[PDB]
Ligand binder design. Structure first.
Ligand SMILES: Nc1nc(N)nc(OCCOc2ccccc2)n1
Ligand SMILES: [Cl-]
Length: 446
């Protein structure tokens, strides 16, 4: 087991990781910005290092300062969490070059999955079903580009290869808009990613977001831990996630899951990972892979009993997966509501001092948050301040428990989305299940 690790993150995920470390006897180093001295996990850590001022560029994205902190403390590994540097291949490369363990895949694998064109080619080769598309980058030849779009069939979507998660894309519904659409996506991708490579896919009209959780160790074991539905979104940002995905049969789960595990083996994947699919008319289509642990990992933990952060740590230390595929069983149902410090009308971040705080409790209730009474939410970081996860023997119980837990949650002094979450839980279509990726924005517009 790893003696000591730097937690290269903040907020709820840093606390999530700290608890896993404590359970395993692993010493913790909390690197933090000067605005995050009073973070819960910082106050609980074995050692703390202030790595820079509030702005992320000089703290949580500051590669030299993070690696220096690992060096000075005698840490052996760095857990990147999600966001920040977690999908940064050069960071992972530098960490390993510096002689520390990066809690994640090899830098090569991060790089492969961050290049959406090469990722898709690897998945298609591995037997993972993908979206009909260009199978390659689009060039400047607009006659060729029109031919590709005709072959695929309109509507199509142009996507940046260095992009992802709704960033760097636009829908094309006919020839007339194709040239300008490619040109604009390209320009935006050059500006944002210093990588102007774009590709084409069939635009799916009403899909669900269904993603598969995997774990792969360094002993060659790779398993899938069912799926999550993350269709409830606003501006491509997940709002609600659940596990398992409604309407997914054990046969479908097994079908897609086995293909994801096989793909892990083929590419030499290591650690936690997530295969993102669009699901429509009973079919999966791979869009992208995330190499990090994700925000919504707790719903998977609730229905499988597998602690995914502890698995990440075990994997990094050279231990094999603690469970076999035949030992992984979907039991019950879990829903996660993200709690955001945001204005209800503008949807803009609403930072400030929490004056009164109360967490919900009870059977099946899991509150993932660093917030406490008197804690100030800084303006410099993401608006997500907590995660409410509720588990039940079935979906109706999980949702019932979520409604009750949301009503117990008190966060005064700042504006939050608790009222919105309650509205979603009470939404008749959500209660039926299987709403698509456009539902929430449609509901909010009505
Ligand atoms: N609908 C859809 N089709 C394809 N081929 N790819 C993706 O990627 C996810 C990007 O998300 C959206 C969501 C709504 C509108 C446009 C893109 N979506
Ligand atoms: Cl994430």
């Amino acid at each position: 087991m790893l003696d000591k690790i730097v937690i290269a993150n903040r907020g709820e995920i840093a606390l999530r990781i700290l608890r896993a470390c404590k359970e395993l006897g692993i010493k913790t180093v909390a690197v933090h910005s000067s605005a995050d001295r009073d973070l819960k996990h910082v106050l609980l850590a074995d050692e703390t290092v202030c790595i820079g001022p509030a702005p992320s560029v000089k703290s949580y994205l500051n590669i030299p300062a993070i690696i220096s902190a690992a060096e000075i403390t005698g840490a052996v590994a760095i857990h990147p969490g999600y966001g920040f540097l977690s999908e940064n291949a050069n960071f992972a490369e530098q960490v390993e070059r510096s002689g520390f363990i990066f809690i994640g895949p090899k830098a090569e694998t991060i790089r492969l999955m961050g290049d959406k064109v090469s990722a898709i080619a690897a998945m298609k080769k591995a037997g993972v079903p993908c979206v009909p598309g260009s199978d390659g980058p689009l060039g400047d030849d607009m006659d060729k580009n029109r031919a590709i779009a005709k072959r695929i069939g309109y509507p199509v979507i142009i996507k940046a290869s260095g992009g992802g998660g709704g960033r760097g894309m636009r829908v094309v519904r006919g020839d007339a808009e194709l040239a300008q659409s490619i040109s604009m996506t390209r320009a935006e991708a050059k500006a944002a990613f210093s990588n102007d490579m774009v590709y084409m896919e069939k635009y799916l009209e009403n899909p669900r977001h269904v993603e598969i959780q995997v774990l792969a160790d360094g002993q060659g074991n790779a398993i899938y831990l069912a799926e999550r539905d993350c269709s409830m979104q606003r501006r491509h940002q997940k709002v609600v996630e659940e596990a398992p995905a409604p309407g997914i049969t054990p046969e479908l789960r097994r079908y897609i899951g086995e293909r994801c595990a096989k793909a892990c083996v083929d590419i030499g994947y290591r650690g936690a990972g997530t295969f993102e699919f669009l699901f429509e008319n009973g079919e999966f289509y791979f869009i992208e892979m995330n190499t990090r642990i994700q925000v919504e990992h707790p719903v998977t933990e609730m229905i499988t009993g597998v602690d995914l952060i502890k698995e990440q740590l075990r994997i990094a230390a050279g231990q094999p997966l603690s469970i076999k595929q035949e030992e992984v069983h979907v039991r019950g149902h879990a829903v996660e509501c993200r709690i955001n410090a945001e204005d209800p009308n503008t949807f803009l971040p609403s930072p400030g001092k929490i004056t009164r705080f109360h967490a919900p409790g009870g059977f099946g209730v899991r509150w993932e948050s660093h917030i406490y009474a008197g804690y100030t939410v800084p303006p410099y970081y993401d608006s997500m301040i907590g995660k409410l996860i509720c588990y039940g023997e079935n979906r109706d119980v999980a949702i019932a428990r979520m409604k009750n837990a949301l009503q117990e949650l008190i966060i005064d002094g700042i504006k939050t989305n608790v009222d919105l979450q309650i509205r979603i839980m009470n939404d008749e279509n959500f209660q039926h299940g299987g709403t698509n990726i456009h539902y929430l924005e449609k509901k909010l517009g009505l």
